[PDB]
Design an enzyme around this catalytic site. Structure first.
Site, mmCIF file in Angstrom:
data_model
loop_
_atom_site.group_PDB
_atom_site.id
_atom_site.type_symbol
_atom_site.label_atom_id
_atom_site.label_comp_id
_atom_site.label_asym_id
_atom_site.label_seq_id
_atom_site.Cartn_x
_atom_site.Cartn_y
_atom_site.Cartn_z
ATOM 1 N N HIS A 132 -9.490 0.492 5.019
ATOM 2 C CA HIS A 132 -8.210 0.724 5.687
ATOM 3 C C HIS A 132 -8.404 1.629 6.900
ATOM 4 C CE1 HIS A 132 -4.076 2.045 6.382
ATOM 5 N NE2 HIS A 132 -3.715 0.967 5.705
ATOM 6 N N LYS A 147 0.033 4.252 -0.093
ATOM 7 C CA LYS A 147 -0.673 5.366 0.560
ATOM 8 C C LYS A 147 -0.506 6.619 -0.297
ATOM 9 C CE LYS A 147 -0.205 3.081 5.066
ATOM 10 N NZ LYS A 147 -0.126 3.280 6.519
ATOM 11 N N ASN A 158 0.856 -1.183 0.000
ATOM 12 C CA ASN A 158 0.000 0.000 0.000
ATOM 13 C C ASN A 158 0.896 1.239 0.000
ATOM 14 O OD1 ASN A 158 -1.917 1.984 0.368
ATOM 15 N ND2 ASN A 158 -2.499 1.322 2.445
ATOM 16 N N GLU A 218 -5.278 -5.219 10.593
ATOM 17 C CA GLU A 218 -4.392 -4.113 10.944
ATOM 18 C C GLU A 218 -4.451 -3.853 12.439
ATOM 19 O OE1 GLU A 218 -6.492 -1.080 8.100
ATOM 20 O OE2 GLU A 218 -4.368 -0.495 8.276
#
Lengths: 245, 241
Positions: free
Chosen positions: B92, B10, B8, B162
């Site tokens: 997320h 981001k 990821n 996560e």
């Protein structure tokens, strides 16, 4: 003030339909005195910017408030400049009221975009319950104060007034009602920023604009153009670009 | 279960830096049995997908829950497919807790993407105060219920846990949650789905800890954050070999 028409495509776009829109814009007869902008979904910003002449601005529909970092799903003004796009729409009513963006966040994003060298269409406007409570100015001025809190310069800002009280309800705002808000917003700029900025800044109307009502809205003295919604995807867009001439 | 490593990126990317990352991926030798994904910012999805061999998946970092409409600033699974991308990361922690996405919205987006033929990495996880309150399972299970509610098929889903709460997470702590989520899948969906679904770990993953995490029986891979921007990503992709 130069007449300004921006087409917000919202969540609409595809390689096929974008190409058809670009061809329509490229071949249309458009008032040379109109500043024209289109705002595609982010996936299509680089390709639309490659295919459309620089006579047209290409804007993102949102961005974030720092150049990079741990913000999954966000894009920054630095990225917009990297793909050749110099405009962003910030504070659109859909982002405030559906995606829950606060006044402060819109102001922080606006200041950062300007700092990065991206021009901003900053959107404001009140809902029906606010208008019926007599809070039209209170709400519009609070949203502008959050932008002014972090801004030192206004030469790269366009303000868009969205009559959310009409957009969300099916009511229709008259040209007199739009003019009244645009005038109040301009007087706020004169009062809180400066007479020279108030005199220069474009305040564009972001209620429902079609080929049927654009000319009567455009003649209002404090309406400087439009932030167009669904008509941005249609041949009406050309008549709206030509509304002032 | 096929090992799965997603990077990821981001809000990091530019034509110059993306090119260095693409060259890094292209020059790497990666375990042929590992599924590898990268997720660039949305502006760069078409170009990154064009430039990366199809051995790599290219994912959006978010999408919305209908194909089109008056959602300024949002993109749909239909648009992802239109630019050649068939993966999305949904739910997320940054989108839930900074950008205020609800459990219900994540579930609606997940069901819609799957219905549109886009594969989904669906993210769950608890905050520090929730873990200290003994609510890790309560939070994870509430988040999975919203994802599960309207899903009928699981072959195109990967679950990412996560630990937003991390402090440092140990391999024992990750294993403990992954096992609990898998046992939840056994009772709420089916044992067959539970045995086949990938549950990947999305806490802080580095070249130094990936091999210890990968040996855990219910850890099937990683959703990598900052190390996805570094050569360390390749070592993490090779953590299972």
């Amino acid at each position: 003030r130069k007449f300004f028409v921006g087409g917000n495509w919202k969540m609409n776009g595809s390689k096929k339909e974008n190409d058809k829109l670009i061809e329509m814009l490229t071949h249309a007869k458009i008032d040379p005195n109109t500043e024209v902008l289109v705002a595609p979904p982010a996936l299509y910003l680089p390709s639309v910017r490659e295919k459309l002449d620089k006579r047209f601005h290409v804007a993102a529909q949102n961005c974030y408030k720092v150049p990079s970092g741990a913000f999954t799903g966000e894009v920054s003004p630095a990225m917009l400049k990297d793909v050749g796009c110099d405009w962003v729409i910030l504070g659109h009513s859909e982002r405030r009221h559906i995606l829950l963006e606060t006044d402060q966040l819109v102001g922080e994003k606006t200041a950062h975009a300007i700092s990065a060298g991206v021009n901003v269409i900053a959107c404001i406007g009140e809902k029906l319950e606010e208008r019926e409570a007599g809070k039209t100015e209170e709400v519009c001025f609070r949203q502008m104060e959050a932008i002014r809190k972090n801004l030192s310069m206004w030469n790269h800002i366009v303000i868009a007034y969205e009559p959310v009280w009409a957009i969300g309800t099916g009511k229709t705002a008259t040209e007199q009602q739009a003019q009244e808000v645009h005038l109040a917003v301009r007087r706020w700029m004169e009062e809180k920023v400066s007479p020279a900025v108030a005199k220069s800044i474009r305040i564009i109307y972001g209620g429902s604009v079609t080929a049927a009502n654009c000319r009567t809205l455009a003649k209002q003295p404090d309406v400087d153009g439009f932030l167009v919604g669904g008509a941005s995807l249609k041949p009406d867009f050309i008549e709206i670009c030509n509304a002032n001439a």
